[PDB]
Predict the structure.
Amino acid sequence: QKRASGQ
Amino acid sequence: EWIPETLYNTAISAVVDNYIRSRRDIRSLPENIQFDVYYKLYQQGRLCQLGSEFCELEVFAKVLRALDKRHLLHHCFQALMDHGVKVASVLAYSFSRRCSYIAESDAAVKEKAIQVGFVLGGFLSDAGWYSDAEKVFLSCLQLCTLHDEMLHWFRAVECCVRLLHVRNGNCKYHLGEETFKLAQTYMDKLSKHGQQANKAALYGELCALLFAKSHYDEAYKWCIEAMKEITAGLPVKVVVDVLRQASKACVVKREFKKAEQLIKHAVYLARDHFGSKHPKYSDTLLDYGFYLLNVDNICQSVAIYQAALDIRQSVFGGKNIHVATAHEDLAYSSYVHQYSSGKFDNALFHAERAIGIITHILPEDHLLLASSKRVKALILEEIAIDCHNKETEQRLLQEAHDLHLSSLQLAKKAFGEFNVQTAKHYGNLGRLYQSMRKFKEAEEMHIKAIQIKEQLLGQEDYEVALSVGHLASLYNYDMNQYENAEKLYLRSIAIGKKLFGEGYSGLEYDYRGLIKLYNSIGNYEKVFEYHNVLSNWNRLRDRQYSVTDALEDVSTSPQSTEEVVQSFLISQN
Amino acid sequence: DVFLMIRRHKTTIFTDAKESSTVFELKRIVEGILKRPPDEQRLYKDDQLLDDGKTLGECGFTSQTARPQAPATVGLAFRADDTFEALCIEPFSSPPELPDVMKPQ
Amino acid sequence: MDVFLMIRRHKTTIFTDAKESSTVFELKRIVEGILKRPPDEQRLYKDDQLLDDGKTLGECGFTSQTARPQAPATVGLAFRADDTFEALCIEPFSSPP
Amino acid sequence: TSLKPRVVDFDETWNKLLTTIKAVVMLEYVERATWNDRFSDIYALCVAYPEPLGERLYTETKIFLENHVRHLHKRVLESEEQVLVMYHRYWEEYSKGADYMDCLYRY
Amino acid sequence: MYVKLISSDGHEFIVKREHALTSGTIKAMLSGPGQFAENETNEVNFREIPSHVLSKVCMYFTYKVRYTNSSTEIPEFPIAPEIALELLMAANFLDC
Amino acid sequence: MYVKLISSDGHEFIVKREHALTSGTIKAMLSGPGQFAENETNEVNFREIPSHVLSKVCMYFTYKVRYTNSSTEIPEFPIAPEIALELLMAANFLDC
Ligand SMILES: [Zn+2]
């Protein structure tokens, strides 16, 4: 994936 | 073996089948018998006959005295609210009406009304009807603020302690500070008479209030105050509440070493006195799952929430705010756990259940939606990315955008423009606009989130780290800005390794993006050494896959009360 | 602003007086109602002569305990000819006592 | 097969059980072992009608399907002051409200 | 009467209860009918009206048992050089009384 | 072996002790100073249980003892609706 | 400016005329042949309304008139449960 998990 | 039924349970069925012709005489029965007739009415499915007798306050006061069979009473009450009859509001209004009449009465009648109000408000707050438990507790306070005597200050400060719990849970944070000020005024009035009430519960409720408004600096100070105020004679429920709120305040200031001890002791106390099938044990389980999710122990956090939700679906019933909070907490934990796997089937099912309950029992302009919605608005995003279609992707991203806008509007109306929850919503919107290919809007939202969060939290806080990680992912993968992405990735990596060590899960999502960055810009030595770093990270990640269940990790009597409290207090120096 | 029920035998004068106003104005307001001079009448807050000099707030007629919802009663006698009579304030009536459903019967 | 009886004499409402093939003399034996009276001292009154000291409970007039333990068949009983065999005085239990 | 909740006064009922309970402990003879009526007294106290007197009954039983054990302690301590034998007989009496009061207080 | 459950109307309800011990309260009443093992039968005076409900309690004692651990189909105890509420109060007090 | 609301028992609830016209039925009774100013106060007979409920009616008159167009939050009128039904029929008859 590109970005981290949604906060 | 076919054991014949007890004459008690056989006569109960005969009484229920003859309910209409013997309804008046049932109210003149012992409390243990009278509750069992109503529980048999619920079991037989005759809710309308049962609900027409739980609407009366005095009849419901006797079934509230059966403290043993309260787990059955909660389930009957939740069945009645799902039935259609609004017994929670009817009982609250009946108590307030019958309460305004005996304001001028004698001390014995007012004492009886105060006790009935405490048991009824405690039931309605335990069941989750905070908008209806507030009226009962408001009427109890109105009785207490009539005669300026000795015991009335104690009962009024107890009322104001219970008003914070039914206002923090109802997201009435504007009235929470006023209620705390009134309670502190009454404690000062007590102190003027040489008597000091125990302030642990009030300070724990205020810590919950300040954590809810994202005031972690003040929440940590007030939980320190609450833990200093814990004595040996406190009830188990009060010390459990204080311990779990102090754990939630410690984990959000990233004092994980103290938060783990506080929440493990809270879970141990909840499992001892209350059991494994109690609402308070489920509350401690939710706070334990919050701890485990914040400390990159997500796989155990999912199982902890799954254990927490299964208690709330058994003690309570269907459309309940406690079951809804368990669903929205489990939906987010399953989301973060299955983020890499992509199996957002249970997470979406749990997030949809949470919204399907909160919308039914709360107004559309309520703050508790802003959590549930955004959780769905995360999962709906990741399903949109995983889906190969463009039509379904566009529809899901538009739905997630509507949900994120609604949640951001709710958070702005409740807290303000400069709150940490608003910063979280801005970061989520930035991620979504990155997914929606609106790169300029994503950059603006992420910059707004950084500007709001940097001043509120620490300069090198964990939330700032993950948000600069999101912004670096946007700059690297999408906006092809190859220097700002580099510096933000380095910041995120540094904060992650400073806080969680080398086992932080966001480290891989930073390293892969940074390797892609360097492959885009060159410096193959950097690429080689970061491949080595990623291999080492994978090694430490597979080594730390012990994932032993945290339910038995709290063990049996590892320490005791005023030892975890004492350790937490002495560690503050 | 204090609200009262000046009952004498069976009448019940529903008057409103200022909190700061004295008992003499309370006796004089009956001049426009029963047309008898304030000299030949005295008030009674549960067997308590209410003299002209002392104010309504001094004799316990606070606005909290004599709100319009439940005004505070005050007795009265009209001296007959020269000697005052006892408080013959008759009770209103007995409302039908609804049985308690929790009473065992 | 088991047959349950609710022998009654005045206030006494002695409960007992005996097989279908059991004899009335066995009920006399039970009453002797409980009420301390010889078998000739009492004669059972099945449905206010005299019962012979011999015979058996199977053809007496009640069986298992009509003398179940959850609804026993009442049986009268009376004694004598050596003569005239004073009549049974079974009173009703009470009036259910 | 009947097995229903009723307005029962705790004072005289508890006094009648105590005149039996003091003899239930320490193995003193009580009439069988009295012992059987004390069960109805316990039930009537426990399901009393308006408020059940189970809390008051439990508190009074705790106070009485504390006073009785204190009196037994004083009688044991005031006797010396024979403390073991009379303590053992007191313990046997109090153990039988505890079992019989658990039987009596079963409701 | 045959306890004498005396009701509030003076009715004696002589029944086997094995059956009567199925209720905890009768077992408690027969334990302690109220044992009194005289001539094999000892009375249990119920000062507040009527005869019309104590008869049903004794019939339930026989019903429950005879149907212990029985795989045969167990019919419901025939509690008349006119005495269902009293018997329930006599099923909590007696713990039967 | 005062009216004498005589109840059925004989209690003469002398209330201000501005308060009495809150109820439509009293305003109608004080119109026509009923507005004849006998003495100074118009004696209104209420042979069907007892005193224990007419007192509550007059209290409601002095409550609504005082608390009309109130800026602050208004407290509910205290109606006792035993009076509530009789004061329900008196509120309908008086149209207040
Ligand atoms: Zn219904």
